[PDB]
Each structure stands twice: as C-alpha cells, then as structure tokens.
C-alpha cells in the first residue's frame, strides 16, 4: 500500500528505518486479525495451563495480559526477554544451551510434556527430536 504512516518518510527516509516501520505495521495487522480467535481460547480454557495458555497468548501477542495471567506461576523470565529484548540473540542462545544441557542429562521427562515446547518456542528450535525419539 505504501500509504501515509504519520509522516514516516519525514526527512531522508533510510532504507532500514522504512523497513522497520513496515515491519511494525505488518505485525500490528497480524495481531489485529488473530484477536477474535485468541479471545475465544482465553474463554474456553478454564484454569490457566502453562503448556497451552502461554502458547496461545504468545503467538497472539499482547505480552501484558500474558504476564497478568502468569500471576499464579512466579515467572517473568519473559518480561525481560520481550519488553526489552536488548541482548535477545545471545540471551536465547544461552537459554538454548541450558535446555540442551538438561537434555544431555537424561532428566526433565518428569516435567509436563508440552512445557518443553513452550521453552523451545522461546529458545528457537522449531523441531526437537528428543532422546526418546519424540
């Protein structure tokens, strides 16, 4: 569309700046179009489950409400990651390292099966073939 975006192209638009503005608006669109479906999943789920609730909220955005819902579990190892995101790459690389280190210890199977998937979402591995060939 390349429409007016509150004078995005004010003074000598840099390619990077333009691309970033485009990204912002495109992400706004994604959040707006998935709002209705996400709202239903909030209503359908009763007691919040970190395996499913977190997943839904994260992919639908709105990190603030996600944190509110997480009053029950004392975790904010995420507000730090998604409201600031300063050392994003390095941070999540380290979290991946930590996760694979636990996997290399033949433990963490007691933990809820799909809580591991929530962690993979943050870390950055779309497919994890575990030691049990899962």
């Amino acid at each position: 569309g390349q429409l007016k975006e509150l004078e995005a192209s004010l003074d000598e638009p840099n390619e990077y700046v333009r691309n970033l503005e485009r990204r912002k608006a495109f992400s706004h669109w994604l959040a707006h179009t998935a709002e209705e479906r996400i709202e239903e999943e909030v209503s359908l789920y009763g007691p919040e489950r970190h395996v499913e609730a977190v997943f839904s909220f994260l992919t639908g955005g709105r990190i603030s409400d996600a944190c509110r819902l997480a009053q029950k579990s004392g975790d904010h190892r995420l507000s730090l990651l998604l409201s600031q995101m300063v050392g994003s790459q390095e941070m999540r690389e380290l979290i991946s390292l930590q996760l694979v280190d636990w996997n290399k210890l033949q433990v963490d199977h007691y933990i809820q099966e799909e809580r591991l998937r929530v962690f993979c979402l943050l870390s950055g591995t779309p497919v994890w073939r575990s030691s049990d060939n899962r």
């Binding site: 970190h50 603030s64 944190c67 029950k72 579990s73 004392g74 975790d75 904010h76 190892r77 507000s79 730090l80 990651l81 409201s83 600031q84 300063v86 050392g87 390095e90 941070m91 380290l94 979290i95 930590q98 280190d101 636990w102 210890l105 433990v107 007691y110 933990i111």
Partner: protein, 251 residues
Amino acid sequence: NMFEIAAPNASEKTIVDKLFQRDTLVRQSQLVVDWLESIAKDEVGDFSDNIEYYAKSVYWENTLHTLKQDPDAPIRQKLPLDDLDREDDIRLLKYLFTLIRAGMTDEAQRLCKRCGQAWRAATLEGWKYRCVWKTCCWRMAEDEQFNKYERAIYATLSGNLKQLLPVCESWEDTVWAHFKVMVDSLVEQEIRASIISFNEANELPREYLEANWTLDSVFEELQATDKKRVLEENREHYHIIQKFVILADVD
C-alpha cells in the same frame, strides 16, 4: 552538551546519556554507589562452599534423582523440592548476593553459567517496555517462595528493597541501597518527563516508588538505626569524615 542532545527518535540509550551528562547530584550519587561496589567484601570461588561445593553437574541433581526413584517449576508446584539442592541453592544465592552487591556482575554471571542455573541466567540476562520489565521484576520479588539472597537481588535490581539479604547491609551497603533508590526514582521520573517510555509500561504505578529521596534524607535514614538510635558506624569518625567529604558539608 552532546551527551545531553536528544530527539524523539533517540533511544532510551540516548535519553539516559542525556540524564547522565545532565544530573550532577545524581551522577555524584552514582559515583557514590560505584565506591560502595569498589570497596567489595567477597567470598572466594574455589575456596568457599559458595560454588566450590555447589559445582554439581547441574542444579537440583539431588531432586532429579529423587523424582526418578526453572524457577517456574516449584513456584507452580509447591511441595516437591529436595533439601540437598535447597541447601546448595542457599549457599549459591548467598554467593550471588555477595558477588553482585559487590558489583562483580560478569563474574556472578560466570558463576551462574559454570554452574548453569537456569533461573539465575534467565532473570539476569537483559542488557538494559523496560518500565514494564522493571515493574514485573518488582512484582516477582514481592512474590513468595524465592530464596533469601535471590529475593533481595531481584528487589534491588528492580528498585525496591527486600530484607532477607538486606538484613546484612552495612552503613555503606545500606547507603548504596538508599542512594541507588534516590537515583532510580529520579531516573524513572526522568524518563516520565522524557515521555519516551510507554503508558502500559507503568502497569503497576504505585507498587514502584517513583518519587526520590534527597541526599539529606538518604543520610538520615542510613544513619537512623533500627533500634531508633544513632548508628555506631555513624558515630565512627573516619567514616563520618569521608561522609562529610562526599556530602560536601565538610568545612
């Protein structure tokens, strides 16, 4: 005034640069905290049970074995925890409060890593909205069930005071506390004036102390003892001398 030059598209980095070149009193308090950290009392790595004994392959290896037979984990599920790892974590968090209240941050991270403490690394990995993040930290410190020194570490890195490890704050340590409090409060009011920060970021406005204490009140509070008394380290002269030298009421 180049560091105090900013614009609307200038990041929080540059707004903080403007504050840092701008505020004389606040920058002096920041140097004061820097001195608090420069005079550091530290437990050794390879000679103290801090981590020299809590150098297990991973955290809660004792608990894992028992189960076979992140801080999200016990916060969600109450009773499970095991005492061996509990004590190991007590000693580790003692080490961490020590090293970080000393200000050896990358060394404390080296500890959190060479041990590999998921919650340690995670809770302390951010390079620098941000207000939302800080409010969240404050709320997590407010939450129960986290260890003593770790609770204090989180409250402090958030801009609030716990007491567990802050039960062990010297006149200069609690001075670091109250000066950092003044500086953080003026910092938040500074960003609010430099509106660059977002509204939904101050999600819990009151639960963070935005208002700041002035240097004289910081000193009065740090001197007033919990027994409604005058502090011993306060009545000491050489400390009092350096104190008047810093406070600039020295003649």
